[PDB]
UniProtKB/Swiss-Prot annotation, chains A, C, E:
GO biological process: alanine catabolic process; L-alanine catabolic process; response to hypoxia
Cofactor binding mode and count: Binds 1 Mg(2+) ion per subunit.
Cofactor(s) of this protein: Mg(2+)
Organism lineage string: Bacteria, Bacillati, Actinomycetota, Actinomycetes, Mycobacteriales
Name of the molecule in the record: Alanine dehydrogenase
SMART domains named among the record's database cross-references: AlaDh_PNT_C (SM01002), AlaDh_PNT_N (SM01003)
Organism: Mycobacterium tuberculosis (strain ATCC 25618 / H37Rv)
Reaction(s) this enzyme catalyzes, per UniProt: L-alanine + NAD(+) + H2O = pyruvate + NH4(+) + NADH + H(+)
Subunit structure: Homohexamer. Trimer of dimers.
Role played: Catalyzes the reversible reductive amination of pyruvate to L-alanine. However, since the physiological environment of M.tuberculosis has a neutral pH, it can be assumed that the enzyme catalyzes exclusively the formation of L-alanine. May play a role in cell wall synthesis as L-alanine is an important constituent of the peptidoglycan layer.
Other known facts: L-alanine dehydrogenase activity increases when the M.tuberculosis is shifted from aerobic to anaerobic growth conditions.
Length: 330, 324, 330, 324, 330, 324
């Protein structure tokens, strides 16, 4: 089938759903990759090497969304793309439909089959396509948190790792998840005195192991938390699905309250497309139909099909007819 | 004696010439410490700190400059500060007089004894009070270069240390010097693929030793510098492909005042020993019994003593060893 | 029962099926260990300490294979040993019968009960007795790959870790398995700039953790692969169950194409006998009979019994009557 | 010649002035090595070791002191050992004569040529034979401070490096010196949160470099020392809140003889080269062709040569360069 | 319900069943925390911050054991506390009843409901509340073992990490469990040449990974063991549910034979109360009744209830009527 | 001027006296760079590299030696190369003239100005151009010793770093020198249990510091060396039980040309600065304004200047300071 990779049109979005690496496997494996001119240009990928790997570069998004059996995207269709949604195609991308009835409706109103990146889940309840983004995000939280600590940024005026004879910043990472673990790693590498708080003692246990006790760990509690933040020069909320610190101290969620992987497209594109690669294939090969019964992880992401809503949590958050996944998969 | 420290007026300057530690060691040797209200507020040293430490918190600058037998600054007196200078006062701060004919004149026409932080020099030819600024400046370059590397800062869009399975950023530091060693250190801690360039292979060996091979080294030929700079994401000038960031420390960018809370201690921790030799024995005694301090002396009783600053502005030299 | 450890007679084979350590537990636990003179001499083990631990040193292989209830071996019997295979004994060793009908036939034609080292498997599908060999192998791939990089060896003429101001080799490890992980470890320790490629992102994830990003990881793809090898000074195929690189660059599988734990017997003997120890015991204690129903991992290795073929994959690769394992175990 | 080593009689001293290695390099240059039976038993060097190495194992001390042309000790002759001293003997050991008028007299009234381990000195002003004792002394302080930190030792009740989720211990080492560097090293390896204080910022940089930031550094102001010491669990004096432990190396505690097996080699490994220059050429030749050894010479033919030890006990000085 | 935290009265016991952290969650979550004056004072916790977090400080132990719905303790009641055991309360603490019929009887004779800290077990058979103690213990074994190596302590007279040009001690850790892993970590950090012996090759495998082969590993055997201890300057028995070494060499179990987390209360109190926190809550919230059927891990710790013995192993070790856990939980 | 580099003819030599970087910095100072076709092919520097860099690729050696005002080599002219030498030519390369009476004569009878790489010497008594060869030589010894340790190489049959649960290899490096430090470094990275021996305890401390205790150190007594060497698997001579491998760098084995791609840059990166002082000012000027270069001068206008090479072959000395 002819797969399509259109140019992300959303605001401040410079990523691309595929790399010359994935495109190269689609091609030399029996498929046709329709890539829109400049789609990857935004994350340092010209069509020069996109073609030197296999890319049926086309001029407009119209031709891309058309003749493309599988449309790989990074973000969900925006306003002007609704009139694009085909019925005989498969939309594989980040949807957050429970965040857009308008979006959800347009996918049902167009009867297109779609799979949401964020809900593809494996056995241990893991979310593979979100993992990379959490990694990119957490490492960024630190680089961004460190910069905003500059007095010029309205920060306290403290250097992440100080200098000889002078103390470094005291960084607090709330949570030892992918993001919390990656945030501490960088802040620590930059020289800050990082302490990570979690309620899960095994996560804290391995952090002690990983940095021979260099990255401090404190059992997380509302009392420990409040205590740790008072002292903190920078705090990172790495806890992913009302209280304050000192003047000049920074707060980065995932005083200057700061608030992503779009910031580093080259990186993030690869990070995600590498996680996406195996599924895009299972899709391009045997179709979303055989791809979802042969793989309950990719299936768990099914979002819509010919006016069908295949996600209860969403049909719940908005109150709409739920159409069991098992049934639309025969 | 009484030493005074006025709040810096230089726009965008957040450092202070003394910390609660210094304003506590002078107070212990029989000295009255005068500090302007709000002197170290921009570097997190409230008057409370300076106060309950033995320091006298005067209302404004006037009171500081009037009394202060020795005055401690970070930057030199700026334009609107020329009327403050006193004949019988010892000014201690970064002067860079060889950069402003206007500054030099005010101190000269002033008859003030000023000693420059940046020219103070020990035996090995080291600049003690200027070295801590190169440490901060070196670490900052990396934190900053990593920041402007973001697509949204004009940068290419590369995370310093990538993420598993995805290639890390390519950093090139030119100079195995004090600042370069700091940039590579931090850039390396961010996960980045760092390489340092230098024609001093002795420095290449200690960097090889320290980071045990993780931070790459390349003899600095103009051939490699070019090739190295062609492939990089961030190049740090501690002595280009589209979107690369070049930070130059002396997308583009060309500082220790950005992190005042950090650099105040760094500078005043180096300055402290001299501020002491000055508060106890005078500029004459101090500078007499200490050559490194002697080398910083810039002006006194109308004289301009400096073969670099003097053979710059076309002025009469004065053997600093004479006034000594 | 009297266990027997004969001298490996195969070519270039200097290993031994047991160490004074294991022999010491066989003895002071109720059994008799019949070790052939010089059996361990080949891997730095004289009979001096073999007896100082418990060893009924005997002169020839004939007496060893005879009176020995359990014959522990490292390699499969060769030409002259066929006339040795008893019917009332147990052959526990590496067989690769699917690689030798002649060998397989001789074990059936002699009606001997045997268990193959390479097919003993645990729950997570793991192969314990092969693990150590993969470790030895991978660490060797690097030491051997580094030596063959010497211009004198016909190599490019590059030192693994270069010297101050000069660049090290660029080493590529294909695969993050036991072997791939161990290969990167040594090459990295030797100073090379190693990059490991894998399709399994968790393996890459932990390699980043283990060396704080010092050992580079790149999602493995046929495009990434080809790209990585072009640059490479040395490449190690650590992928265990047609394209080229630069002149002088080395290739080591598991330009100079090089091709094992027999290379370092002292090491490998211990490596394997340590993994073998627990089973040899379960065998020597309760017999292969009770040893295989009480332990499905050791049972999964059963190969033959009194003319019986207890391994389908083998009976398949050669087309021969398959005799269900469950049945020959009552 | 023949060099002799007697068992130390100083109570609680377990070191020996020579190891099987030294008693084997002298034996190879045509020297008879006499060692008392049981000399190095308290540091794990049985007579078997000393014996099957080329050493002569005499019955007791008398035989050692009588024969020994050069005598090697660790501590100085104690009270009951004054009758042992010989006019024509070279005593080599830690003497601290400037601490005992009584000791100095026995060697003086003795006419013995004694050379002090602690005053021997090379160019850079280093004390070669005294340095290894500061390494051991530094590492011991941490092992000990970590021990007395236990509630049952009077200490507060803190594990040096805590455990995951629980805060680690706070260690403060005062002095970036040889001993301080060792304490921080070990205290840091125990998981503890270590900080070193010093007014020598050059030492602060090498500690920063070495442990790459894990061991904290703070310019030693009397202000920080206090604040630092106020928050600590264990403070090590290598130059307080309830239950804190302060170890002072020169709950409280104020040494290399505690781990004799370790420190014997450390000391005798530094001493060895000199014991050789002494056994081959004599105190005269050796001390002549080697200034560092010349600096250790303390007594000879009744003379007391030392501007520190002499201007202490009120005695006549003797130009060591004269007797040379 | 009103929870109670009494002052440990046992000998040389300076720990406390709760920290201002846990007490803070009990309070600002709907409960009343009755803490006895000075209960925490012994492990550096005054009532100053105990109240500044929420503590109904009371004068005597009598009032504490009274009006307290849940009595959190570190150690089992001693002689004078028997007359304290209420019937309408819950005793959550370390019991070791199989070590005290007197103790066991008193809990049955008082009909109190109790849950033993040491038998709360999770799915992978893990014992969470013992883990922290094993960590504290193992790290101590090393600090204590290193001190007792001092000739003054009657030891051989060897410094853990020697000094330049001179060798460090040779430390042997028997077992790679929590305690064995933590013992090696510290001894190694102190500079000793540590070698860890285990029969479980995965534990040895990860120790190699964790310290890049710096902490030596040797497959554990009675022959390897005896060999390793001969050389050893210090040995730590980290193997938790008759042979000798050199003169001056130390032995620490978990020559100077030495024989705990009470040694470092500040540490250990937090270590354990952090592990205890989640259960104390599940208890204080829904009662031991709903707390044990909703959580089979905490339930597996049930020890007694109104004259009932809810632990077979104990009723076995002493021979007493066993009263099935499932039945006393409806 | 024009500097020339001929392909090495010495059998088994794969290094080249100049890299594309050097042949690019000389070309920038107005110099014609002549390089023989295939000069750096054995070290991966095709003529393409040398070409598109500013270098003149001559057909063969004749053209190189004829023109070249300064000639750069790695090894000295061998037998069949004696007819190439020119009176008015500056030869720069490793000469070891004090090793071949025959070599010395050809340069002497030649009237050529030759400067030896190995005798060039800076203040600290360091041999700049010879040091990089000891780094390579040190790392190679370990890679090689680890290789010949294989049962199939005659070795004992030990993997350098063992495998979990199995004991690692025992490495002994004799010499804390530049080469020894490199061998221990690499041998340690291979997982091996490394120990370094030296009578210079200062070097023992930096190795202790660097690898923080993982690489063992032992004072070099002849007693320990023996005991140490008795227990080893691989001993590296950077200054035996059956199957042990002893590599000696100056089963047995007694080098930088083995990894030409690496060592060419290493040597030419050190040589480069001198090749420059030579191409710009001449052997006279260069050697004049630079003592380290002055120390390398070996022959000129028929003279043989060297108190080591001259008092070897029984020849007349010529004050190098005279011809200067």
């Amino acid at each position: 089938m002819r797969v399509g990779i259109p140019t992300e049109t959303k605001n401040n979005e410079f990523r691309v759903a595929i790399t010359p690496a994935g495109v190269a496997e689609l091609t030399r494996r029996g498929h046709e990759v329709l890539i829109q001119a400049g789609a990857g240009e935004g994350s340092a990928i010209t069509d020069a090497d996109f073609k030197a790997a296999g890319a049926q570069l086309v001029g407009t998004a119209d031709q891309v969304w058309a003749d493309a059996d599988l449309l790989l995207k990074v973000k969900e269709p925006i306003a002007a793309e609704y009139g694009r949604l085909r019925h005989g195609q498969i939309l594989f991308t980040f949807l957050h439909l429970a965040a857009s009835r308008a979006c959800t409706d347009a996918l049902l109103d167009s009867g297109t089959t779609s799979i949401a990146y964020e809900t593809v889940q494996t056995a241990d309840g893991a979310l593979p396509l979100l993992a990379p983004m959490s990694e990119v995000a957490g490492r960024l939280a630190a680089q961004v948190g460190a910069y905003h600590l500059m007095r010029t940024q309205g920060g306290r005026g403290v250097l992440m790792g100080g200098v000889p004879g002078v103390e470094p910043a005291d960084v607090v990472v709330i949570g030892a998840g992918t993001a919390g673990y990656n945030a501490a790693r960088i802040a620590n590498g930059m020289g800050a005195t990082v302490t990570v708080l979690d309620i899960n003692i095994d996560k804290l246990r391995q952090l002690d192991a990983e940095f021979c006790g260099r990255i401090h760990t404190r059992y997380s509690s509302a009392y420990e938390l409040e205590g740790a933040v008072k002292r903190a020069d920078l705090v990172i909320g790495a806890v992913l699905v009302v209280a304050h610190m000192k003047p000049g101290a920074v707060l980065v969620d995932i005083t200057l309250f700061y608030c992503m992987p779009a910031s580093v497209p080259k990186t993030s594109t690869y990070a995600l497309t590498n996680a996406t690669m195996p599924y895009v294939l299972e899709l391009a090969d045997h179709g979303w139909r055989a791809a979802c019964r042969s793989n309950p992880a990719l299936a768990k992401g099914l979002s819509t099909h010919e006016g069908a809503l295949l996600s209860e949590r969403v049909a719940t958050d908005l109150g709409v007819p739920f159409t069991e996944p098992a049934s639309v998969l025969a």
